[PDB]
Amino acid sequence: GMVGLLVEDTGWNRKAYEGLLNIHSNLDVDVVLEEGVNSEQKAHRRIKELVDGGVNLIFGHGHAFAEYFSTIHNQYPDVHFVSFNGEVKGENITSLHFEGYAMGYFGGMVAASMSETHKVGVIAAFPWQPEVEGFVDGAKYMNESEAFVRYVGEWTDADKALELFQELQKEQVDVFYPAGDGYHVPVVEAIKDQGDFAIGYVGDQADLGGSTILTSTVQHVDDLYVLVAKRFQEGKLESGNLYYDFQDGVVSLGEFSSVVPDEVREQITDAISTYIQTGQFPH
Structure with missing residues (x-):
């Protein structure tokens, strides 16, 4: 060794x-x-x-x-x-x-549950990202919120990623999943600024944001x-x-925000445990 x-x-x-x-x-x-x-x-x-x-x-x-x-x-x-x-x-x-897929799904449940406009969005890099599907499905499984998916050409283009944020901004989207390590913070920030909610990516992201980070899809x-x-x-x-x-x-979910109602959690925490044993999503 x-x-x-x-x-x-x-x-x-x-x-x-x-x-x-x-x-x-x-x-x-x-x-x-x-x-x-x-x-x-x-x-x-x-x-x-x-x-x-x-x-x-x-x-x-x-x-x-x-x-x-x-x-x-x-x-x-x-x-x-x-x-x-x-x-x-x-x-x-x-x-x-x-x-x-899994983590995106559960993340998407929180996302939608915490949405006012029943309009959640993903700003990812490419279509082949599993998280993108599982996310949409989560925001469908329980709130049936219209999901918006925008693709950045790549992982480091904070510029474009921010434009996509803005764009979806003008579409009454209020919960974001900026699924690109490279531009994740730049976009989380702009969100905290706008006062909207985001979902963390690959990292616990709670302390690097704060109460804006509903949760994080952690790897x-x-x-x-x-x-x-x-x-x-x-x-x-x-x-x-x-x-x-x-x-x-x-693979897990990040510490939920104080903001998230204590029930929404339980639901997911349970869906996850279920999926861990069964291997299926709440639908």
């Missing part, structure tokens, strides 16, 4: 930094981080040093590390490779994925890192693409 982490220039790579930090903290291994790994070239070189130094478990934060690891995981049989998000096939190579990257580094130690870590959701314990 000696863990390395490859990270590339800016979701939030800080959730990976804290992940590696807890790995070295909650387990007893030595940790090493390589930053600015932006090409197969660099990735391959930094893998040599890492295994030279004696790392035997290497993480890649991001979808491209899977391809990077794939073109090299066979010359390092004695080393296991985990990627965050790619598609991988092999024995000493794994890939991690967070399940998005525990730091936890998943530790988790995955623990199975690799206990020899029990699978290979290939693994998927995590509310049932695996690394």
Whole structure:
């Protein structure tokens, strides 16, 4: 057990930094981080040093590390490779994925429940984001609020994302789900300003906003890192693409706002528990 982490220039790579930090903290291994790994070239070189130094478990934060690891995981049989998000096939190579639909759904229930205009909205980056569907379905499952979905071209365009906020503003939308790590705060802020409600993204977001953050659709990257580094130690870590959701314990909802009626919570807290055992949504 000696863990390395490859990270590339800016979701939030800080959730990976804290992940590696807890790995070295909650387990007893030595940790090493390589930053600015932006090409197969660099990735391959930094893998040599890492295994030279004696790392035997290497993480890649991001979808491209899977391809990077794939073109090299066979010359390092004695080393296991985990990627965050790619598609991988092999024995000493794994890939991690967070399940998005669920969290979006439950988040959307709170969203709608807390809406005055029965008009909720999602400002996401791309259509393939599960959270977008599950969100709409939540704002339908219980309030039947007309959902507005706007797509930003990408994850870092705070500008456009803010325009989409404004746009939906002029449509009497009052609860927002800005599902893009890159522009999330810029948009949460503008909301707190306007006095509307938002749903946190990937992070607890409560303290970085406040009473404006009804709740947050949280993905525990730091936890998943530790988790995955623990199975690799206990020899029990699978290979290939693994998927995590509310049932695996690394996906949740953030601390509800004081604002949310104590009943709306109970309902969801129960829907979640149900979904954790059943595997189905309140509809």
